[PDB]
């Protein structure tokens, strides 16, 4: 059954499908279900928080169509915001190191957004600085994906309840999610804990930057994860345990899932599926394990993931 026609492309954000894994996980392990957040029209889970953060500022009188938003971003949040801003009548300015690919640049520019490149030597510290400067000197609205409560709230209102109804009458024994901003794990974890009081909530972070585990920040290749700090949008009390995933482990899992399940997802999804399988082997046959696939592998054809 197809959705009845809509007036705006943002009206089809959410309601993402779930697929059971058949080949990458043993028959004597728990069932593993993955939620394909790349089925959102913009291609990633960030579709949800991009729309949520704009709608929140709209209901509060902070912004109105025709206004300009600015955000320091080098990932799917910029894509989601450029997507949502084009659909709802906003100007978008994004700051990022000059090291970003030309493909990523063209994607953001195709939606009509303006790009402000910062010194690559300054990484995201330079992009954050320039974003604040543009905010102050020119009056742009800064959604702040690491502090905006609409980020974990939209998962509490949509992503979570979707999973509740998708697993109606079935007990979810563990939910696992990679932590970038932390909004997915916090919003979904809160909703799932209320329904399944025995559920285990697991945070996934890069082994090369195990900040939630207590280690020091470090360079890693798990795009979308490992921000290097504790985001304000992360409920640090929501997860019962942490599972660390290495760089090559996530890549090899994504390649396996693509070739053996037909599910082509990003590197963070490989880290999520690997962690879900490890938890599925601990839980055993009969139990149920759920994780989230944030983005599609086609977005990563120019990374070592699929080259």
């Amino acid at each position: 059954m197809a959705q009845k026609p809509v007036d705006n492309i943002t009206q089809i954000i959410g309601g993402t499908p779930v697929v059971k894994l058949r080949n990458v996980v043993d028959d004597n392990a728990a069932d593993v279900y993955v939620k394909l957040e790349y089925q959102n029209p913009g291609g990633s889970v960030k579709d949800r928080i991009a729309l949520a953060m704009i709608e929140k500022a709209e209901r509060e009188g902070k912004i109105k169509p025709g206004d300009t938003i600015v955000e320091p971003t080098s990932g799917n949040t910029g894509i989601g915001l450029a997507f949502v801003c084009a659909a709802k009548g906003y100007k978008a300015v994004f700051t990022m190191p000059e090291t970003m690919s030309q493909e990523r640049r063209n994607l953001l520019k195709a939606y009509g957004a303006e790009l402000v490149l910062t010194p690559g030597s300054e990484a995201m510290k330079g992009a954050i600085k320039k974003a604040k400067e543009l905010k102050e000197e020119h009056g742009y609205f800064e959604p702040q994906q690491f502090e905006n409560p609409a980020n974990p709230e939209v998962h509490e209102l949509t992503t979570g309840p979707e999973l509740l109804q998708q697993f109606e009458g079935k007990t979810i024994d563990a939910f696992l999610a990679g932590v970038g901003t932390g909004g997915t794990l916090s919003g979904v974890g809160k909703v799932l804990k209320k329904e399944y009081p025995n559920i285990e909530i697991v945070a996934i972070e890069p082994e090369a930057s195990p900040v939630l585990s207590g280690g020091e920040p470090g360079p890693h290749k798990l795009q979308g994860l490992g921000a290097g700090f504790i985001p304000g949008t992360l409920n640090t009390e929501i997860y019962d345990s942490i599972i660390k995933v290495g760089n090559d482990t996530a890549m090899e899992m994504s390649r396996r899932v693509a070739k053996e399940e037909g599910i082509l997802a990003g590197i963070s999804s490989g880290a999520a599926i690997y962690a879900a399988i490890q938890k599925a082997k601990e839980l055993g046959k009969g139990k149920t394990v759920v994780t989230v696939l944030p983005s599609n592998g086609e977005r990563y054809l120019s990374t070592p993931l699929y080259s």
Binding site: S74, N76, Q145, G218
Partner: peptide, 5 residues
């Protein structure tokens, strides 16, 4: 250190 978020 760099992220991509």
């Amino acid at each position: 250190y760099m992220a991509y978020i």
